[PDB]
């Protein structure tokens, strides 16, 4: 388990840390895209959740990439909405991390990060 602080995150990036030997994608979430993350209808997806059950974080955004296809990886935020266009089979998706554009029906495990008193522990 790695331990990072609040403002010590790499904010304007998509840093692929090898935490636990696993690729993981990290993004600073500005509070302006609560209007903009969920304008996508999740009925164009195959299974919906919410933003709430997925992202329990107001201003940070983490999801890992041990993919069930074979374990692919995307390219940083170009493409369609601010999401992540992937060069393996042509997948790209929303700013939050839920796939429908391209053949990937499921979605990934979110890491069990945890907050306790000006700390967050990815693990």
């Amino acid at each position: 388990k790695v331990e990072v602080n609040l403002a010590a995150i790499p904010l304007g990036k998509n840093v692929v840390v090898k935490w636990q030997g696993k690729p993981v994608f990290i993004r600073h979430r500005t509070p302006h895209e609560i209007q903009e993350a969920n304008s996508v209808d999740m009925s164009a997806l195959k299974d919906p959740q919410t933003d709430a059950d997925r992202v329990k974080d107001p201003q940070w955004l983490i999801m890992l990439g041990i993919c069930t296809h074979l374990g692919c990886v995307p390219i940083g935020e170009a493409g369609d909405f601010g999401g992540w266009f992937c060069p393996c089979h042509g997948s790209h998706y929303d700013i939050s991390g839920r796939i429908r554009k391209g053949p990937a029906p499921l979605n990934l495990e979110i890491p069990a990060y945890e907050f306790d008193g000006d700390k967050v522990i990815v693990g």
Partner: protein, 385 residues
């Protein structure tokens, strides 16, 4: 008596390779078991001399194989003989098993001889998997990732077996260091099962291509089958030397010359040619737990074959319909290897599902049905009622 018959150690040599009574009419298909003992000696000797220069750490494994190819005197000969000698070990073993299918060698009284040979086949597949991961190329990392994640689908003990098999949270430094120590050991367990294989052969002897008794006409082993063994030994070494010296990278993948990277996925993940038919059986079941059971049941279905053969005659020499369906099973095994090297696409998904059905229906449906039909055709073609 002679000294070779009275000495305790020379009597075992005399009773196996000198004075052993052999059937007179066995052909060159009975020479494959002698070639398999030569293949096992080449793999053990070339591997011990390469192990004096090898480092099994995760940041030293790929560069020590490159050190063998460049700095060790005749080190490229040691590696190419070892990498191509593993493909020749599997080609002769496929021909040895198919000889027993055609001539009815699995039948009684040789059922214990057939069951020990199935154990040898499972241990050889495991050995070639463990040594391929010790190169730590790009094909070695993602082939170990696919196979070890299959055991996470077992109920209630999935996540405990896979973490104990990794030594951590992924394929890492403890995975490669324990895969090399297990790769040194399992060839010595195969050598102990080969001795138990020859002990079961000694009490009944060999069969013959006619399927009838051989106790009426025997010749000894020395100077007939010693010099008939030499013909296929020199042909084996000549074809193997043409691959080692003139085309040493035909039976491999180019992606295994890239160092392994856990953050970059290759475009295609394909095994070696001798694991391709069992890889297409695994990808044909959409469920994840049912695919692992079906891939291991493709080897264990050879054990049901003494019970589903309902014929009173041993072998396929005088059987018309059994000869036709034997070669359907053979070319279905080649199509399963070609499907396992393609992409998951239309129409290769349906073609691999029908071919997986024909693999299992041969042992369980086709063989007991046409054995019974041939028993009745032999009867009513002679009896006049």
């Amino acid at each position: 008596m002679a000294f070779r018959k009275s000495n305790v150690y020379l009597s075992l040599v005399n009773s196996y390779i000198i004075d052993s009574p052999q059937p007179s009419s066995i052909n060159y298909w009975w020479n494959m078991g002698s070639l398999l003992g030569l293949c096992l000696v080449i793999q053990i000797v070339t591997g011990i001399f390469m192990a004096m220069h090898y480092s099994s750490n995760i940041e030293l494994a790929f560069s020590s194989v490159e050190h063998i190819m460049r700095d060790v005197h005749n080190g490229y000969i040691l590696r190419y003989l070892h990498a191509n000698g593993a493909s020749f070990f599997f080609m002769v073993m496929f021909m040895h098993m198919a000889k027993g299918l055609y001539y009815g060698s699995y039948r009684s009284p040789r059922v214990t001889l057939w069951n020990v040979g199935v154990i040898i086949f499972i241990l050889t597949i495991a050995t070639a998997f463990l040594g391929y991961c010790c190169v730590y190329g790009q094909m070695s990392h993602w082939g170990a990732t696919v196979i070890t994640n299959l055991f996470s689908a077992i109920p209630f003990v999935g996540n405990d077996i896979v973490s104990w098999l990794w030594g951590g949270f992924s394929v890492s430094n403890p995975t490669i260091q324990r895969f090399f120590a297990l790769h040194y050991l399992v060839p010595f367990i195969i050598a102990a099962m080969v001795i138990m294989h020859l002990m079961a052969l000694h009490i009944h002897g060999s069969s013959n291509p006619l399927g009838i008794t051989g106790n009426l006409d025997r010749i000894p082993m020395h100077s007939y089958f010693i010099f008939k063994d030499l013909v296929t030994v020199f042909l084996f070494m000549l074809i193997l030397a043409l691959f080692v010296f003139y085309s040493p990278n035909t039976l491999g993948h180019p992606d295994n010359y890239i160092p392994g990277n856990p953050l970059v996925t290759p475009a295609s993940i394909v095994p070696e040619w001798y694991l391709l038919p069992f890889y297409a059986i695994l990808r044909s079941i959409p469920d994840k737990l049912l695919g692992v059971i079906t891939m291991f049941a493709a080897i264990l279905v050879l054990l049901v074959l003494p019970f589903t053969d309902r014929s009173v005659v041993r072998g396929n020499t005088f059987k018309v319909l059994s000869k036709f369906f034997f070669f359907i099973f053979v070319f279905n095994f080649v199509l399963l290897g070609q499907i396992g090297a393609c992409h998951v696409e239309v129409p290769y998904v349906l073609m691999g599902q029908i071919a997986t059905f024909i693999y299992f229906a041969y042992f369980l449906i086709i063989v007991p049905v046409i054995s019974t039909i041939e028993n009745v055709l032999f009867y009513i073609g002679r009896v006049n009622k």
